[PDB]
Amino acid sequence: AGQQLREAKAQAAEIVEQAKKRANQIVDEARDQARTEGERLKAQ
Amino acid sequence: REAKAQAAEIVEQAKKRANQIVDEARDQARTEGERLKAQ
Amino acid sequence: LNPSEISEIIKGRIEKLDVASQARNEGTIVSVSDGIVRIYGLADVMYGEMIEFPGGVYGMALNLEQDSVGAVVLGEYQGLAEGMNAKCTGRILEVPVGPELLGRVVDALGNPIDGKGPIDAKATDAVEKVAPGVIWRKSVDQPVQTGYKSVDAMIPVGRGQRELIIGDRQIGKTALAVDAIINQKDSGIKCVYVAIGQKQSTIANVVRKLEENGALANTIVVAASASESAALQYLAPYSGCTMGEYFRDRGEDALIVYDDLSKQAVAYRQISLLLRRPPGREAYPGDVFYLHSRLLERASRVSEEYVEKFTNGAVTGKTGSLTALPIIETQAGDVSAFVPTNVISITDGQIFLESAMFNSGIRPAVNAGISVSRVGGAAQTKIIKKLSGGIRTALAQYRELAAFAQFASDLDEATRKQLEHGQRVTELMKQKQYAPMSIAEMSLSLYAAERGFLQDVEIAKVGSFEQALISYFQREHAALLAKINEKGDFNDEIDAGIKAGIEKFKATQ
Amino acid sequence: EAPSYADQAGGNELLETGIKVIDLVCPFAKGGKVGLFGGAGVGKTVNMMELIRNIAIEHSGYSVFAGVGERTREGNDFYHEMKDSNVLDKVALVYGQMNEPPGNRLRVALTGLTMAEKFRDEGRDVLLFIDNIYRYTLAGTEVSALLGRMPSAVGYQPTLAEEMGVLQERITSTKKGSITSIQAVYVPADDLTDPSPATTFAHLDATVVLSRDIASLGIYPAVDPLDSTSRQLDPLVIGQDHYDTARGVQYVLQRYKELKDIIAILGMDELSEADKLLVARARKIQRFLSQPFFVAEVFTGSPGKYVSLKDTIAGFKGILNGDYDHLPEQAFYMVGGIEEAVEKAKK
Amino acid sequence: EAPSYADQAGGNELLETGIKVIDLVCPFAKGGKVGLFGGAGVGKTVNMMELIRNIAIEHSGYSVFAGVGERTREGNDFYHEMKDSNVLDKVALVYGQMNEPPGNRLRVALTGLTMAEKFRDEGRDVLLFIDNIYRYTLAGTEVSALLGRMPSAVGYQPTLAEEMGVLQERITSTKKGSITSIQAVYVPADDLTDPSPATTFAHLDATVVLSRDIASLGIYPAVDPLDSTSRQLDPLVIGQDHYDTARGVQYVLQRYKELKDIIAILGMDELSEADKLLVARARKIQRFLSQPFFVAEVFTGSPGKYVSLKDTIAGFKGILNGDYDHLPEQAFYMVGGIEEAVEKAKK
């Protein structure tokens, strides 16, 4: 009973860490697209 | 069976937390769009 | 790229040319040295009056000797020469004022340096003024949230208070004041940042951080960089103060940051030695105390009667305020220096930053034993006032207890209880830069500590516990956080609501 | 001119303040001069406000309050406090704050004293309060060099001792009437050897010293029992029981000052059986000096306590004789009289 | 005049130096300013000559070197070294050494900077190196009293901060081109609180502080991790792995510095089981920060080492995690990368 709780708790931490890792990709890809469009408009 | 139920709830709360993190990241990335006027 | 428009703009200056004759008082330049100009003949020049030189260069009269006038140049002096005419304008130093300055970067005289166009302000005001007297003030009893729990819980700042930020080089003095400006974007408090003797790239980085955090539209930035005349660096804090006072006098609230009053004192010492005024305690002028006391006594809270009288009845039933956050740099922690000694004796409190705590990873680095707020609980909301009572003095006693019981054998329960609690509050006071907390977030963190919920939590897990607890209350108790954030109110219903949520959190996550 | 040598008074009537440390080691007297010495942020204004509350309000004569180089916010809070307390009809208020020119700060002390001298010369008993007398000296330093005077040691005006003597000798009780005075004395950089603080001690009857090291430990009022003193602390003026209690407290705290550095390097267990017991009493005495004031409720959160002379003596004799050796160290921190310490130990 | 506020550049691109302590706690950036602070004979010229060697590996543009008040022999050695190495056709050299009168030493800095500003304004990326920026200020002190100016603290000119700002603000990157600048700063009598060094810190992006106490133990470069810092040491610039490794090293070295007096009187054996392990790791970290240089080969004989940022982070992270608790303390001294410490321990 204790072993499966420790296993589930270890997987719970991994699920939340993968979500944090994913959030940074979502935010930095938006920054690079928005800055690139800003340069597209600035050159024109 | 109590250990099965608690392990299910521990992973359920983790999936609920993961969903919240990605939705907040979508709102941050959507708000980061201020660059359409700034610069 | 609009033609005709540029012409009519030029026609507007040609149409309004002062074609009539003027009666003026005049002199001649005798000597030009280190930003100081000596003149003969200005009989009606007043002290601190603006002097007009050829090519639109301006100076200020500081020494009215019997046979000569000593003036300081408000810009580059190397173009001036012996024999040039010096003229007299019957006006004291004035700068533009109003909401048109919000989101702009300007020099010590109010000229735009951001290249974002002209400032269509509709009001100028004198740079040097006397603060409102004893009878016109009102007691400080409204909060100014910095967003940091260590400051907002132990060293609170109220609307109209003056709180000094002091420490050595490179330990977060600018980071604390800039985060306090960022937290006001939704508070309804206008902001002013005065940069004295800083390099222009450091000023540009602070402005980029204000813009990236959405705080620039609510801030006026006054710059007097390291290459500018010592007169502009000496005047910049007074110009910024005058821009902040516009809101105070009209029943509104403002916040001002002087990033380095120790650099303003060094600029004033230069001018004074070049004017040949006799030196004091560290070659500093005799009146270096009055330099800072005349500036800092303007930051105040004014009564409804003062605002009603100033606005001729246009604004009623509202108080106005100007809150100040001056910064001072010490050398190797030495507070006995003349300038640090003066400023600590003028402000309504101080926040001491310690390099040993900063190197030890306590990054807000606030020494709770040396730091203090003279307004205390009157500058806090009901919830933070009750949840933070005695924390500052309890941490001060924990630091002493941790050193006294360091090598002794196992002590009684009273000693273990105090030591184990002080270690948890010490780890809790740690916060990251550009990450402010609302009243509800700080309240949950304070409640979980003072009500004993952290007693089962490991010291190395306090940060993770706080971050998870906040994230859980944000998803499952959003209506309670919204109720606490309306005015920071507290009662048995909110107390029980927080208790039930923290118990359910620890028992299930 | 100051009153002549033949006009000087000679009274020794003890004045109760309601503050434990002050009533124990620094007993005041009616018609005498008191100085509250301390650096920045240690309690000078707060202790002066508690003394005004415990003396000025209850008194039936006239008072003068002079704010010299004070914060304009403190002057507003005190005015509304005297007005709301219905005490204002007994007080003359003179204010010269830090935003005012050097000529004003150099003469406001003489204005307040001129009003007090008119009341004294009418045969009245008067109270004179001065929030910062250091600011009179500083205004002279700020202007001294522009007056063509060469500087002395530590950058002070050459006239430091005479400018101080010309003012301090007028603040006195005479055969006509009396002036009881409390002055707050700022100590530059916490150094009591600085020429200004050092020249001030000789002008006062009671010298109360506030310590930054005690304030840095959350203990309030932050008064140092070893450096503080009064002309009235004599068995022929008060009594042997009071004097023995005061010297007893001082002896215990003086011995503890050398042991503090020993315990920090070699630990508590290496001390003698008598030293271990004495250290525990010294740490308890150090905490029983603390007391929450009515004017400090906004800073402390807890309510204010007034303690009497007999209550103060009995509490300190109990800790010295060992009647409370069983109580925990934290029970004496912020608790008025000795009874409340016995009650705090149960919480 | 300096470039305007609207002409400023917001660059944060990391510059690898190949020197472990610098790349860990003092990360440099392209187009930024670096300062090397130190007393007499501690390593300013040797550490600058090693940086000149390492930055020229990736940089393809021009360089400008201004010799302000230093040894004439060192200017001759540097000129022939570059002439024999064929590097000379991409460097502009200006000299005003110690043998020169005050006017030369006062204006040589401006002459070298004027050549660097021409190349920056042409749209190029250039390096500007200054033999000692303190000599520009000192030449100003020798002449100040002759110019009729009243002296300030410790005899310095009253214009000290303005003379420094007028030069320092021109040494910057703009929207046209970039100037990466490195300057040696002499520290008078080892005092970092002296007005000249104290006024220089605010003009730099990265501050490298050298110590005589560290140089005395044998460690070269003699950098102090606790006093040295950079604007690039931010999680948003260098990533969390580098940032946490650097913060971990500083925490261990700070805690070891607090125990120095206890260890000196009672020795290491009296410390707790936790402090003993931390002191052992602090001693290994302190030795692993050392590195044999390709310009220092003449002094000892040992071959120079270039260590990448990846290898630097991996070594210190392993020592912090405890992956090397079994290897002897002398295995970390003078070895470049972490794998060489494992091979040195075999002897």
Ligand SMILES: Nc1ncnc2c1ncn2[C@@H]1O[C@H](COP(=O)(O)OP(=O)(O)OP(=O)(O)O)[C@@H](O)[C@H]1O
């Ligand atoms: N809360 C924090 N958490 C982590 N790091 C911090 C924190 N606050 C400040 N720092 C960091 O420490 C350094 C403090 O620099 P800052 O400019 O604010 O200090 P300063 O005293 O004003 O320095 P200076 O004397 O150059 O003006 C910066 O690298 C900053 O990012």
Ligand SMILES: Nc1ncnc2c1ncn2[C@@H]1O[C@H](COP(=O)(O)OP(=O)(O)O)[C@@H](O)[C@H]1O
């Ligand atoms: N008796 C006291 N109880 C609690 N806090 C106190 C007390 N005395 C002083 N303090 C704290 O110290 C601060 C400084 O006291 P204050 O009298 O203003 O100092 P000073 O006049 O010596 O500069 C107060 O504002 C308060 O925060």
Ligand SMILES: Nc1ncnc2c1ncn2[C@@H]1O[C@H](COP(=O)(O)OP(=O)(O)O)[C@@H](O)[C@H]1O
């Ligand atoms: N990296 C190093 N390795 C070995 N010895 C060094 C090193 N750096 C400096 N030293 C020693 O210190 C001396 C002085 O160094 P130098 O750079 O000339 O000092 P500074 O320029 O600071 O006066 C060198 O000649 C050498 O003996």
Ligand SMILES: [Mg+2]
């Ligand atoms: Mg700063």
Ligand SMILES: [Mg+2]
């Ligand atoms: Mg005071």
Ligand SMILES: [Mg+2]
């Ligand atoms: Mg050398």
